[PDB]
Design a protein around this ligand. Structure first.
Ligand SMILES: CN1CCN(C(=O)c2ccc(F)c(F)c2)CC1
Ligand SMILES: [Zn+2]
Ligand SMILES: [Zn+2]
Ligand SMILES: [Zn+2]
Length: 459
C-alpha cells in the first residue's frame, strides 16, 4: 500500500450532470481511459494520475485547485480556473482572460504552473471538486508516460514540448506546451454531503463565490487544506528543504534566548510561565527565575481563548512574573508577556495560503496557523531590535569596519568603543533577527520593557 490502486472505485455521482449516463460502477483505470489517456501496463513510476489523501498531504506544496466551468464542451467555450486566481477561456474552434484556442491556452498553463511551483515542489497536484468538464479538458493540456528527468537538469520532468520533443522541470520549461505527468485528487471522493460552497462556507468566511471558475478552485484547495491540516493534524510528516528553513529555525532559537534573557535581566521577574509546546526546554538555562511549563499544542483552527488556557482553577497566579508565549497563538495576550506570533499574511515559499485567513507554514512540518490579528497585542508593544551581551571582550581566532550603534548593549559600547568580537556577534545577531522577521515572525513585549535597564547589568 504505497500508491492509489487504479482498480479502486470512484464515485461518479458528482460527474453525472456534465456527463449524463455515466456508469455508477467505475474504477480509476476506467475513468483515466474515459478521459482519453492510455496507461499501457507501464511500471515506470507513474502508476495512477490520481493519488491518495496521504500522498496529497505529503505533497501539499504542489496543490493547485482546478475547476472548469461551461461558458456555453466541443461546441462551447470553457472557463479554466486555478487557485492562483487565474481564469483562462479556451475555445474549441480574479484575472479574467478572453477566449483563445487550446494551443495558446496550454502554453499559458505551463508558464503559470512553472512560476507558481518551481520554488515549492517537484510536481503539481490538481485539487478537484470533480463534476466532469475538468477531467475531460485535461487531454487538451496534459501528456502522460513514464517518469522522466529534465533535459537541462537532474530534476523530475513536469513539462513537455511538442516543438522540440523534449521534457523539462518547473525551472527550465520556458516555451513548453504540455503539463507532463500531473497528479490529481477529487475532494468529492472524501464523503461530503452537499455542494462545494456549503461545505467550504462551514469553515471559511474569507473566500467568496463570485460565480467564476477560479473562485471554486480556491474554495476546493481551501476545503482540502481544512480537512488535511486544520481538523486533522499530522506533525510526524517531514517535508523537504526548499529555502532558508535551517537559518530561520536557528535565528528563532537565538532571538528567543536573547529576548528572554534580557527581560529576566532588566526586570528580574521571580517566576516565568512558559505556555506552549509540551516539548519545550528552558531557553535561558542560567537564569535564577522559577521556570514553570504549561503544555498547549499549536492551534490550527482558532486562536486559544486566554480564559481557557489560564482560568478554571501551576502557580495559578499568572499575573505574577512574566508569561512566555513562543508561538502559542492566543486571542489576547496578558499585559506581562513575551510573545512570538507568526504573521500569516507574510509572502514566502514556506507560507502557503490557508483556511479562513489562516496560513499553512511548512518548515520541516506543516503548521496551519490561525489568521494574524493585530487586536491580540493590545496590552503589549512591538519589541524593538537590540543586541545584548555580557560575554568578555576578547577576539580569539573576516575583516573589520568600526561598529557604532545605540542598540549594541555591551560593556565595550558602554565604555564608548565596541570591541571586534561584539561587533562580529552584533552583525551576526542582526542578520539572524532580520531572517526571522522576514520569515513572518513578529515579536511583542510588555509595555514596561526598556533596554536602558540593561546597561546597569555592568557594574
Ligand atoms: C547576580 N545574578 C543573579 C540573578 N541573575 C539571573 O537570574 C540571571 C542570570 C543569567 C541570565 F541570563 C538571566 F536572564 C538571569 C543575574 C544576576
Ligand atoms: Zn530542469
Ligand atoms: Zn476558504
Ligand atoms: Zn566587547
Amino acid at each position: 500500500p504505497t500508491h492509489l490502486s487504479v482498480d479502486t472505485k470512484f464515485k461518479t455521482e458528482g460527474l453525472c450532470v456534465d456527463i449524463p449516463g455515466i456508469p455508477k460502477d467505475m474504477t480509476y483505470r476506467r475513468l483515466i481511459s474515459m478521459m482519453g489517456f492510455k496507461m499501457n501496463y507501464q511500471v515506470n513510476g507513474y502508476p495512477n494520475m490520481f493519488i491518495t489523501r496521504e500522498e496529497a498531504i505529503r505533497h501539499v506544496r504542489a496543490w493547485i485547485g482546478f475547476d472548469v466551468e461551461g461558458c456555453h464542451g466541443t461546441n462551447l467555450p470553457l472557463q479554466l480556473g486555478f487557485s492562483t486566481g487565474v481564469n483562462l477561456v479556451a475555445v474549441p474552434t480574479p484575472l479574467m482572460y478572453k477566449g483563445l484556442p487550446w494551443n495558446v491556452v496550454r502554453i499559458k498553463i505551463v508558464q503559470m504552473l512553472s512560476d507558481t511551483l518551481k520554488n515549492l515542489s517537484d510536481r503539481v497536484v490538481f485539487v478537484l471538486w470533480a463534476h466532469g468538464f475538468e477531467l475531460t479538458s485535461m487531454k487538451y493540456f496534459v501528456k502522460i508516460g513514464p517518469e522522466r528527468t529534465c533535459c537541462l537538469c537532474d530534476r523530475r520532468a513536469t513539462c513537455f514540448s511538442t516543438a522540440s520533443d523534449t521534457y523539462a522541470c518547473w525551472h527550465h520549461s520556458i516555451g513548453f506546451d504540455y503539463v507532463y505527468n500531473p497528479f490529481m485528487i477529487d475532494v468529492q471522493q472524501w464523503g461530503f454531503t452537499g455542494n462545494l460552497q456549503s461545505n467550504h462556507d462551514l469553515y471559511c468566511q474569507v473566500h467568496g463565490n463570485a460565480h467564476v471558475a477560479s473562485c471554486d478552485a480556491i474554495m476546493t484547495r481551501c476545503l482540502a487544506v481544512h480537512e488535511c491540516f486544520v481538523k486533522r493534524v499530522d506533525w510526524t510528516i517531514e517535508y523537504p528543504i526548499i529555502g532558508d528553513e535551517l537559518k530561520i529555525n536557528a535565528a528563532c532559537r537565538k532571538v528567543q534566548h536573547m529576548v528572554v534573557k534580557a527581560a529576566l535581566l532588566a526586570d528580574k521577574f521571580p517566576v516565568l510561565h512558559d505556555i506552549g509546546n509540551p516539548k519545550a526546554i528552558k531557553c535561558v538555562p542560567q537564569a535564577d527565575v522559577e521556570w514553570k511549563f504549561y503544555d498547549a499544542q499549536p492551534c490550527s483552527d482558532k486562536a486559544y481563548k486566554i480564559e481557557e488556557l489560564f482560568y478554571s482553577y501551576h502557580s495559578d497566579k499568572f499575573t505574577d512574573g512574566v508569561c512566555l508565549f513562543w508561538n502559542c497563538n492566543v486571542d489576547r495576550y496578558p499585559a506581562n508577556s513575551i510573545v512570538c506570533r507568526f504573521d500569516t499574511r507574510v509572502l514566502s515559499n514556506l507560507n502557503l495560503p490557508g483556511c479562513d485567513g489562516g496560513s499553512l507554514y511548512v518548515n520541516k512540518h506543516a503548521f496551519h496557523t490561525p489568521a494574524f490579528d493585530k487586536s491580540a497585542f493590545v496590552n503589549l508593544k512591538q519589541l524593538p531590535f537590540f543586541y545584548y551581551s555580557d560575554s568578555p571582550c576578547e577576539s580569539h581566532g573576516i575583516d573589520y569596519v568600526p561598529l557604532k550603534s545605540a542598540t549594541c548593549i555591551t560593556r565595550c559600547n558602554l565604555g564608548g568603543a565596541v570591541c571586534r568580537h561584539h561587533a562580529n556577534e552584533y552583525r551576526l545577531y542582526l542578520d539572524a533577527y532580520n531572517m526571522m522577521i522576514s520569515a513572518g515572525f513578529s515579536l511583542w513585549v510588555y509595555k514596561q520593557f526598556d533596554t536602558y535597564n540593561l546597561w546597569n547589568t555592568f557594574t
